[PDB]
């Protein structure tokens, strides 16, 4: 409807309508226009005199609108009873896109990094890119939405307005950016650009010439490139790791039985164990993603997992973790394909599930089979290390059940574990 706020992405409250006839809620207007700019954030129209004119008379609010909004949509305004900033905006855009994604597109954060997203675009049916799946990277600036996102292809594509760096010449990405635009709108505009290039303002002149001279040749090469570079990679869909809190209680219990078979673990302690596992998962995979992008690799393999482990884990933990991961990958590759993936690897932690979580987190275009095996073995090893020391702490205190205090002692009393996990809250 026409009653949404384009800056904060909400129903308008105390709306202020500028002479350019852009409107924004009084909170946003005060934050952006009154405090500093004295210009419309959408079109940059100067409103210096107009604001002072009305501010000294308490006549900023569009009373007719405001008064109309409250009577005609009181239920919607019940939300307005409830009523960083860039982070809030990004999160709202994700919520909206997660519900109904743009046609032919999906996008979501990379791991827990809200300012770095992955996007995928299916080649429009209209276009010669049909059948291909095109990956993109999205970086939001700190002052989003008042500055555009950086959007570039990571999949090679033949197009007059997209070059070998993946850069996209498209006006709304730069000169025509406005905080009224969303990532959903951007991806749709990119889809239209694939269907209808702009050869008159090209990024790659040679391709634009062919598009204007020999369209047949343009279409043939576009299909050839689609087949060569945009096939066999559909992505994980969705919109990132989501808000679900993953549990590994099943596997923590199994490991505890192996390490301390006469020792139990409380429900609160299990919650903390899940926090440890999830935190280590995110840090290792986030670093492996960094390495894949940095080296322009479409697939995360056990190579990036190992290098991530060597950088992030301290001393002996890193060496033992690397040994465990290497041995798991070796056992996995020389095993019978009939058994379960975890069984092939000699692991308790679920290899298939870790593989899915590595794909769901948008860390890379593809994930090789060795990666989840290596990571699952590292998570299992660290879990066993923690449980061994926490059970020792329990036994030191003449207890038979691990509670959060015993987890805090295990971490604090081991120099390397405190380095790795000391920043995770227990309390
Ligand atoms: Cl994959
Ligand atoms: Cl691999
Ligand atoms: Cl105790
Ligand atoms: Cl006793
Ligand atoms: Na309108
Ligand atoms: Na609002
Ligand atoms: Na995804
Ligand atoms: Zn607002
Ligand atoms: Zn304006």
Curated annotation (Swiss-Prot):
Catalytic activity, EC: 2.3.2.23, 2.3.2.24
Pathway assigned in UniProt: Protein modification; protein ubiquitination
Locations listed in the record: Cell membrane; Endosome membrane
Domain (UBC core): residue spans on this chain: 86-231
Disulfide pattern: 105-191
UniProt key word Ribonucleoprotein: no
Primary location class: membrane
Phenotype upon changing residue 171 to E/P: Has intermediate lysine reactivity
Keyword DNA-binding in annotation: no
Annotated GO biological process: apoptotic process; DNA repair; negative regulation of BMP signaling pathway; negative regulation of transcription by RNA polymerase II; positive regulation of protein targeting to mitochondrion; proteasome-mediated ubiquitin-dependent protein catabolic process; protein autoubiquitination; protein K11-linked ubiquitination
GO cellular component: cytosol; endosome membrane; extracellular exosome; nucleoplasm; nucleus; plasma membrane
Record note on modification: Phosphorylated by AURKB.
Molecular function GO labels: ATP binding; ubiquitin conjugating enzyme activity; ubiquitin protein ligase activity; ubiquitin-protein transferase activity
Protein task: Accepts ubiquitin from the E1 complex and catalyzes its covalent attachment to other proteins. In vitro catalyzes 'Lys-11'-, as well as 'Lys-48'-linked polyubiquitination. Cooperates with the E2 CDC34 and the SCF(FBXW11) E3 ligase complex for the polyubiquitination of NFKBIA leading to its subsequent proteasomal degradation. Acts as an initiator E2, priming the phosphorylated NFKBIA target at positions 'Lys-21' and/or 'Lys-22' with a monoubiquitin. Ubiquitin chain elongation is then performed by CDC34, building ubiquitin chains from the UBE2D3-primed NFKBIA-linked ubiquitin.
Assembly and oligomerization: Interacts with SCF (SKP1-CUL1-F-box protein) E3 ubiquitin ligase complex; when Cullin is neddylated, the interaction between the E2 and the SCF complex is strengthened. Interacts with DAPK3. Interacts with BRCA1; the DNA damage checkpoint promotes the association with BRCA1 after ionizing radiation. Interacts non-covalently with ubiquitin. Interacts with E3 ubiquitin-protein ligase CBLC. Interacts with UBTD1. Interacts with RIGI and RNF135; involved in RIGI ubiquitination and activation.
The name this protein goes by in its record: Ubiquitin-conjugating enzyme E2 D3
Annotated source species: Homo sapiens
């Amino acid at each position: 409807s026409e009653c949404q706020c384009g800056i904060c992405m909400e129903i308008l409250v105390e709306p202020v309508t500028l002479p350019c006839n852009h409107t924004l809620c009084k909170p946003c207007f005060q934050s952006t226009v009154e405090k500093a700019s004295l210009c419309c954030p959408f079109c940059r129209r100067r409103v210096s005199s107009w604001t002072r004119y009305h501010t000294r008379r308490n006549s900023l609010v569009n009373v007719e609108l405001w008064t109309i909004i409250q009577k005609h949509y009181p239920r919607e305004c019940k939300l307005r009873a409830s009523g960083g900033s860039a982070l809030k905006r990004i999160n709202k855009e994700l919520s909206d896109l997660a519900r109904d994604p743009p046609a032919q597109c999906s996008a979501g954060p990379v791991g827990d990094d809200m300012f770095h997203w992955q996007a995928t675009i299916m080649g429009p049916n209209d276009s010669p890119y049909q059948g291909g799946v095109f990956f993109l990277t999205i970086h939001f600036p700190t002052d989003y939405p008042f500055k555009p996102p950086k959007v570039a292809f990571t999949t090679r594509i033949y197009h007059p307005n997209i070059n070998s760096n993946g850069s996209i010449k498209l006006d709304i990405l730069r000169s025509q950016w406005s905080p009224a635009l969303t990532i959903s709108k951007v991806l749709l505009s990119i889809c239209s650009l694939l269907c209808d290039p702009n050869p008159d303002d090209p990024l790659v002149p040679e391709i634009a010439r062919i598009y204007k001279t020999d369209r047949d040749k343009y279409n043939r090469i576009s299909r050839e490139w689609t087949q060569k570079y945009a096939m066999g990679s559909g992505g994980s869909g969705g919109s990132g790791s989501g808000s679900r809190k993953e549990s590994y209680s099943i596997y923590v219990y199994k490991v505890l039985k192996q390490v301390h078979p006469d020792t139990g673990i409380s429900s609160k302690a299990m919650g903390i164990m899940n926090s440890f596992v999830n935190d280590i998962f995110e840090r290792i995979a986030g670093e492996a993603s960094r390495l894949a992008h940095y080296n322009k690799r479409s697939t995360i393999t056990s190579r990036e997992i190992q290098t991530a482990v060597r950088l992030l884990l301290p001393g002996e933990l890193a060496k033992h973790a690397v040994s465990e991961g290497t041995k798991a990958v070796t056992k996995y590759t020389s095993s019978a394909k009939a058994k379960t993936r975890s069984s092939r690897a000699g692991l308790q932690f679920p290899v298939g599930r870790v593989h899915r979580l590595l794909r769901k987190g948008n860390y890379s275009e593809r994930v090789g089979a060795g990666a989840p095996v290596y990571l699952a073995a590292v998570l299992e090893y660290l879990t066993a290390e923690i449980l061994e020391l926490a059970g020792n702490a329990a036994r030191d205190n003449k207890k038979t059940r691990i509670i959060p205090r015993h987890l805090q002692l295990a971490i604090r009393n081991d120099e390397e574990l405190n380095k790795l996990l000391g920043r995770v809250t227990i309390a």
